[PDB]
């Protein structure tokens, strides 16, 4: 008959864009049967008020799906946690648009949540892939540790064990700490020169300052940092010749909104020709039963995808997050961020521009030292010693 699709956007303009997009999707295949109306609500401060608001004002219209987005003003004060919990109580699937935090990538906690942007571990996938092209083998993996660092380290370690190789002394540090000089100094004396960093903004700035004061950012070295470690504080405390990463679209809400609406409409129409259809619950209070068809919907929303649209081709993988993204390798040259390459999928592609390494050495510095200062251990015994 009539089917609604709720959504939690950021500001009024994006709400109007969402309404126009659903109107356009209805202007596509609409041969009676379905009508596909759309509801909306703006982000709110606090969290309990937000959970109550989503509950009443959205589950009071038997919405078949929910669209979320990153809060406009803050950065993590209004993460889409309440929506996921409240709408996963009933197993009503929700779609993330521009949130990437690798806590929603496991279905033990968030029972119905799938994004359209690769969270943060696929950065480690690109780390491993690009490691082969320049052919250096020994790395030290300097990573933070609350949840993000553990996930990134686990992903890289799992990937790196295919070729039977192993990483050097992976070393952690507590979030929001000071005086990391001792740990960094310990990492300085070793036989590896390429170091991989995965930590938040301020921690990255602290690590950069500590490394600079230990003159470890000199020639013969090479760094590797994810998207967060630059572009937040990357013109005030970053060394020269550092190789970052960047998702091409990212904060382009309109394109993601259009693509998500397309995918949801296509999958809803594909599902509706099934024998066992049951409508979502009508009210938040007085109903405590799982929407029976709910999980099945998830499956027909997961495997199908394929709505070839503006952002490219969309194909959700086994556990949510979209695969086959397109990153864009960057580099610093005199406080600039010129582009050096493009990674499309399973293969990097360099460009026509040369690359400056940490110190201006126009070369391809390999990482190895071979100390030749071995320490030896012996035991007092017999005529031998």
């Amino acid at each position, epitope marked *: 008959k009539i089917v609604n699709i709720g959504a939690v956007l950021s500001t009024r303009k994006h709400e109007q864009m969402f309404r126009e997009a659903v109107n356009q999707a209805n202007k596509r295949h609409g041969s009676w049967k379905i009508q596909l109306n759309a509801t909306s609500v703006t982000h709110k401060p606090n969290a309990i008020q937000m959970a109550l608001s989503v509950c009443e004002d959205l589950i009071s219209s038997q919405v078949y799906a929910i669209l979320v987005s990153h809060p406009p003003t803050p950065n993590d004060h209004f993460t889409p946690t309440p929506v996921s919990y409240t709408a996963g109580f009933y197993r009503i699937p929700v779609l993330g648009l521009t949130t990437r935090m690798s806590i929603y990538s496991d279905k033990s906690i968030h029972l119905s949540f799938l994004r359209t942007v690769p969270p943060y571990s696929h950065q480690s996938s690109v780390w491993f892939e690009m490691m082969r092209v320049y052919s250096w083998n020994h790395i030290i993996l300097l990573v933070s540790d609350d949840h993000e660092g553990r996930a990134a380290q686990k992903r890289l370690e799992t990937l790196l064990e295919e070729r039977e190789s192993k990483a050097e002394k992976v070393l952690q540090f507590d979030p929001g700490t000071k005086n990391v000089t001792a740990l960094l100094m310990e990492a300085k004396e070793l036989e590896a020169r390429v170091i991989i960093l995965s930590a938040s903004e301020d921690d990255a700035a602290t690590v950069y300052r500590a490394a600079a004061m230990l003159n470890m950012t000199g020639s013969g070295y090479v760094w590797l940092v994810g998207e967060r470690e630059i572009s937040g504080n990357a013109l005030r405390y970053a060394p020269d010749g550092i190789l970052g990463l960047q998702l091409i679209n990212g904060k382009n809400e309109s394109a993601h909104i259009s693509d998500a609406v397309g995918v949801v409409a296509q999958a809803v129409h594909e599902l509706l020709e099934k024998e066992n259809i049951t409508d979502p619950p009508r009210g938040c209070v007085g109903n405590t039963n799982i929407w029976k068809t709910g999980p099945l919907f998830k499956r027909v929303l997961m495997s199908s995808k*394929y709505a070839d649209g503006v952002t490219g081709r969309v194909e959700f993988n086994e556990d949510g997050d979209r695969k086959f993204a397109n990153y864009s390798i960057m580099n610093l040259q005199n406080r600039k961020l010129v582009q050096v390459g493009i990674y499309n999928g399973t293969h990097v592609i360099p460009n026509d521009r040369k690359i400056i390494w940490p110190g201006g050495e126009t070369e391809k510095p390999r990482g190895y030292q071979m100390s030749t200062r071995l320490k030896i251990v012996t035991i007092h015994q017999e005529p031998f010693v």
Partner: antibody, heavy 122, light 107 residues
């Protein structure tokens, strides 16, 4: 680039069966779905069937229930149209059409084939 | 359902801009989409216009689509040029095809 070729059409007596094969070249085979539409002499065209990106989403024309079936193999980038119990009012052409999305709900096709000939009569 | 209606044929002389419309029987025109298809005799039909007024790659402009509701119909306007581009045209909305109008260059 994107080329479309079809074969398997011809003349046969009433009460027989037929199987038309449409092979593509160039563009990826799995990512798109292709319809089946026919040109009639003098008059225009009329939709027949429609496949999904892989399977599942299916659809047939109103007057062609039971008579026709549609299937595809993604290995050798081919499309098979099998049908039986032929009649006399279908003695026309059959065009191979490729859509633009992965589902046939859009009903928008582009880059046709070249047409095939069928005619059933005594 | 419905049944789109279009004029049987049209005759034109080189250097004149002409409009061709196909009329929708029932339902609002703006509810659904329309596409204009072309074919050469002995040649497979090829799309010229899709999504109301949108030009696929290779179209040499000229082909303009009007989606004014008017009496529930849509039209395409072509500028003054004859060349060899004089053949039957079709418009398609949803599982419905028209008879086809023949564009003839007046000799």
């Amino acid at each position: 680039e994107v080329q479309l070729v079809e074969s398997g059409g011809g003349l046969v007596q009433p009460g027989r069966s037929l199987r038309l094969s449409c092979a593509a070249s160039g563009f990826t085979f799995d990512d798109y779905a292709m319809h089946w539409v026919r040109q009639v002499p003098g008059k225009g065209l009329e939709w027949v069937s429609g496949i999904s990106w892989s399977s599942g989403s299916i659809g047939y024309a109103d007057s062609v229930k039971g008579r026709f079936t549609i299937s595809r193999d993604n290995a050798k980038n081919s499309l098979y149209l099998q049908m039986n119990s032929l009649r006399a009012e279908d003695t026309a052409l059959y065009y191979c059409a490729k859509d633009r999305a992965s589902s046939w709900y859009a009903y928008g096709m582009d880059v046709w084939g070249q047409g095939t000939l069928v005619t059933v009569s005594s | 359902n419905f049944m789109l209606t279009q004029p049987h044929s049209v005759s034109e002389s080189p250097g004149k801009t002409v409009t061709i419309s196909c009329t929708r029987s029932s339902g609002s025109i703006a509810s659904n989409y329309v596409q204009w298809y072309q074919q050469r005799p002995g040649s497979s039909p090829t799309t010229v216009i899709y999504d109301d007024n949108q030009r696929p790659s290779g179209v040499p402009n000229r082909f303009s689509g009007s989606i004014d509701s008017s009496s529930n119909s849509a039209s395409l306007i072509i500028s003054g040029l004859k060349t060899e581009d004089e053949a039957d045209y079709y418009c398609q909305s949803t599982r419905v095809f028209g008879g086809g109008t023949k564009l003839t260059v007046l000799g």
